[PDB]
Amino acid sequence: TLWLTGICHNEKNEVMSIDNMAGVFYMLAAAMALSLITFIWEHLF
Amino acid sequence: YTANLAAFMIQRFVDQVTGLSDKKFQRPHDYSPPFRFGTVPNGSTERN
Amino acid sequence: ASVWVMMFVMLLIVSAIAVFVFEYFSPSFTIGKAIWLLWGLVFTTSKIMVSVWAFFAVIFLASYTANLAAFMIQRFVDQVTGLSDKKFQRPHDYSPPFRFGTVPNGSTERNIRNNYPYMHQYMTKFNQKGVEDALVSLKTGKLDAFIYDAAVLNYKAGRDEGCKLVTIGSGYIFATQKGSPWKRQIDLALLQFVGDGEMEELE
Amino acid sequence: SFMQPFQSTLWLLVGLSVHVVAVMLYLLDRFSLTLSSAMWFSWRVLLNSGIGEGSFSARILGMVWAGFAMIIVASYTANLAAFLVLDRITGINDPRLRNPSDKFIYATVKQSSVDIYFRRQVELSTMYRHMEKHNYESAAEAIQAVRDNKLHAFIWDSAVLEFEASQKCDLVTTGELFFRSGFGIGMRKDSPWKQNVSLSILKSHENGFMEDLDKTWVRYQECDSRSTFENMAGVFMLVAGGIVAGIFLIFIEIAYKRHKDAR
Amino acid sequence: LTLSSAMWFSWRVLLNSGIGEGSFSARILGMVWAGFAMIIVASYT
């Protein structure tokens, strides 16, 4: 108690502070592929 | 789910180096830039 | 206050711009449709431009959601100020009449006899024998609050279960052997202890 | 408060995504409206001025983009709540005073009782090279030292500091009452009038003459508690300049396109 | 407009399914009620 503590003893959950999570970078890879699902079905019947 | 996503991205803390298990120490020139670690000479951890 | 007048000014500006833009769709009523669309978007060439201002209005909605989250979270209130209230002084002039007792033959009772004997005419209807009497009459609501040596109330106030039992204010204290040679010894010793803070260690 | 804190590259990504929405809503029209329609549908749905209606798979993708728009609005309003609602010298127990630094120098006035309370205790040993080498002649010099931001904190008697904190917006009395003593009277030992004066002191405590000086000199003043903004004023400036530039381009573009149509 | 119209306008604006259009002072009061609805949504969220 005399000698140790500085500021890391009072660490306060250093999260992020804007954000760049992955998210939509997955989702866009679905969405255009959805057109690749659909617009090959040219109804030539 | 605004309240839920407020619970997610506030309640992230992360780190990079695990320790000697990393090849950061073991293969520093196999990662660019090469890694930068020094010690005080003639120490105990240097003997280790 | 001043944000309101800014809103009036900006709505007048956008309404006049809408008047001229309807004047140049002439190559359906700014008296009608444009106003109620401004109302709907706070809460066709320039219509995308006004939907941009609707997006701004949503941003102002979000900013005052954050503001009202700052208001109603960052209320704490109290009821009794103290002897200045007529709660103590005129208890039967408020229904229900007020409920305060003391331990008899005390110092604060001498102080209120010096202050108000009529207050004692009320208090002697409610006097006690112990401090656990006060604990029960607060936790069962039999007596409203208490006037004592407020230090004992400061000990056992935090020692309550749940501590909804609020004492007098935030520490607002009211009532603010002869010839022994020990007196110099005791008082210089107490100067040493207060100068060393061992009373704070007992605290 | 500020301008946009949200990583302006991300705002550029938002604008490019709006143009991607425009490209998707015009190129998929031809599978069964290609001039100025889907621009205003993109500014209808992406501004959320209209979320509703106006082949199948293109509109499936469009309402997926509307889902993106709602999620982005939810995330940015969550950030507006976060970065406005989310996240000092407390006393001798601080390492700023247990290990006193030169970025944190503190002082008093020499020949005072406050310096006596410093010099009595033992654990203030590192403090004496600040509290005896930097001192003043008046407490108003320490007040100005706060006001000139010379020294960060000061240690004085409680009442005057609480008064001056209730006067102006530079002062907060922090920490407990350090060295809890009483305020007495300078009386010689052979003075026979310690007696009835202290009886009058007992009368002052018992009959509230202490509380009378609390009314007549102590309890008068307060300050505010920070309870039409800089973000708002930035919105006024940006929206005003945007409306001026937009209107003065309306005339040019509509004039050239009306004379295109006159051809 | 006195049979079943303003019921569905109340469930259009107060549910915020449609905030927009559909004499003067009654509609001024109605958009004041829409302001109330938006403030109540903001407070509950």
XYZ file of C-alpha atoms in Angstrom, chain C residues 25-200:
176
model
C -42.757 23.912 -60.721
C -45.252 26.202 -62.482
C -43.703 25.556 -65.875
C -49.747 22.103 -55.105
C -50.250 24.599 -52.278
C -47.550 26.054 -50.039
C -50.473 27.353 -47.972
C -51.521 23.713 -47.749
C -49.329 20.705 -48.497
C -45.834 22.128 -47.868
C -46.566 23.164 -44.269
C -48.065 19.837 -43.251
C -45.207 18.003 -44.933
C -42.813 20.131 -42.841
C -44.825 19.015 -39.809
C -44.649 15.387 -40.938
C -40.911 15.472 -41.666
C -39.925 17.190 -38.439
C -41.939 14.478 -36.708
C -40.501 16.548 -56.771
C -36.982 17.888 -57.314
C -36.546 19.598 -53.948
C -38.437 16.841 -52.104
C -35.285 14.731 -51.827
C -33.566 17.879 -50.526
C -36.278 18.261 -47.877
C -35.988 14.556 -46.977
C -32.355 15.435 -46.254
C -33.728 18.023 -43.813
C -36.065 15.328 -42.483
C -32.938 13.253 -41.829
C -31.574 16.293 -39.983
C -34.821 16.418 -37.980
C -34.286 12.767 -37.019
C -30.742 13.725 -35.946
C -32.204 16.469 -33.738
C -34.599 13.860 -32.331
C -31.644 11.598 -31.486
C -29.693 14.466 -29.901
C -32.542 15.265 -27.521
C -33.048 11.597 -26.742
C -29.438 11.770 -25.540
C -30.222 15.070 -23.791
C -33.313 13.731 -22.009
C -31.262 10.684 -21.054
C -28.814 13.151 -19.507
C -31.651 14.908 -17.638
C -33.673 12.117 -16.014
C -30.729 9.865 -15.098
C -27.974 12.218 -13.930
C -33.967 12.752 -9.342
C -32.817 12.755 -5.710
C -35.060 14.867 -3.484
C -35.980 15.327 0.176
C -38.998 16.592 2.115
C -38.150 18.031 5.558
C -35.895 21.074 5.869
C -35.889 21.074 9.658
C -37.251 23.269 12.425
C -38.056 25.916 9.784
C -40.906 23.658 8.637
C -44.285 24.070 10.270
C -44.349 20.261 10.189
C -42.774 20.373 13.645
C -44.184 23.738 14.688
C -47.808 23.250 13.543
C -48.224 19.465 13.224
C -52.012 19.521 13.621
C -52.175 22.199 10.937
C -51.247 19.470 8.436
C -53.216 16.269 8.115
C -52.085 13.707 9.309
C -50.427 15.282 12.374
C -46.723 14.754 12.706
C -45.011 12.037 14.686
C -41.725 12.819 16.432
C -40.438 11.499 19.746
C -37.303 11.576 21.879
C -35.590 9.708 24.688
C -36.651 11.524 27.891
C -34.377 13.697 30.060
C -31.976 14.391 27.196
C -29.872 17.334 26.071
C -31.898 18.110 22.941
C -35.035 18.061 25.082
C -33.483 20.768 27.270
C -32.649 22.640 24.055
C -36.234 22.469 22.773
C -37.555 23.465 26.225
C -35.322 26.470 25.678
C -36.845 26.720 22.174
C -40.497 25.602 22.237
C -42.336 24.023 25.176
C -45.334 23.626 22.862
C -43.164 21.418 20.684
C -42.578 19.324 23.819
C -46.352 19.241 24.329
C -46.402 17.494 20.977
C -43.231 15.382 21.545
C -44.282 13.891 24.914
C -47.092 12.132 23.057
C -44.381 10.214 21.195
C -41.429 9.724 23.559
C -39.470 6.484 23.721
C -37.133 4.425 25.869
C -34.509 3.182 23.423
C -32.943 3.645 20.020
C -34.440 0.404 18.707
C -37.795 2.045 19.465
C -36.775 4.641 16.876
C -35.629 1.853 14.534
C -39.034 0.159 14.736
C -41.025 3.401 14.482
C -39.103 4.355 11.348
C -39.255 0.878 9.805
C -42.944 0.603 10.738
C -43.712 4.276 10.092
C -44.918 4.873 13.645
C -42.780 8.018 13.962
C -41.833 10.273 11.073
C -38.214 11.255 11.764
C -36.132 12.071 14.830
C -34.273 14.861 16.571
C -31.434 13.715 18.821
C -27.718 14.007 19.080
C -27.478 13.631 15.303
C -24.192 11.691 15.517
C -26.069 8.589 16.743
C -28.436 9.062 13.804
C -25.329 9.203 11.597
C -24.044 5.919 13.033
C -27.285 4.001 12.759
C -28.537 5.726 9.601
C -26.033 3.878 7.424
C -26.537 0.812 9.618
C -30.175 0.621 8.473
C -31.417 -2.155 6.198
C -31.845 -0.631 2.750
C -31.377 2.898 4.188
C -34.534 4.529 2.878
C -34.779 6.073 6.366
C -33.605 9.637 5.754
C -32.542 11.656 8.804
C -32.504 15.454 9.154
C -31.037 16.786 5.905
C -27.634 15.921 4.484
C -25.950 16.252 7.847
C -27.673 19.492 8.834
C -27.132 19.542 12.601
C -29.452 21.687 14.706
C -28.394 22.981 18.141
C -24.945 23.743 16.750
C -14.770 17.695 38.156
C -13.980 21.331 38.836
C -10.368 22.018 39.722
C -8.759 18.870 38.343
C -5.194 19.325 37.005
C -6.001 16.587 34.489
C -7.647 19.135 32.180
C -4.422 20.421 30.619
C -3.141 16.853 30.213
C -6.385 15.623 28.626
C -6.740 18.619 26.308
C -3.133 18.591 25.076
C -3.486 14.831 24.589
C -6.616 15.433 22.495
C -4.685 18.023 20.472
C -2.110 15.290 19.858
C -4.743 12.718 18.822
C -6.603 15.111 16.498
C -3.219 16.189 15.145
C -2.510 12.491 14.524
C -6.022 11.481 13.450
C -6.455 8.361 15.591
C -10.015 9.470 16.303
C -10.408 9.094 12.532
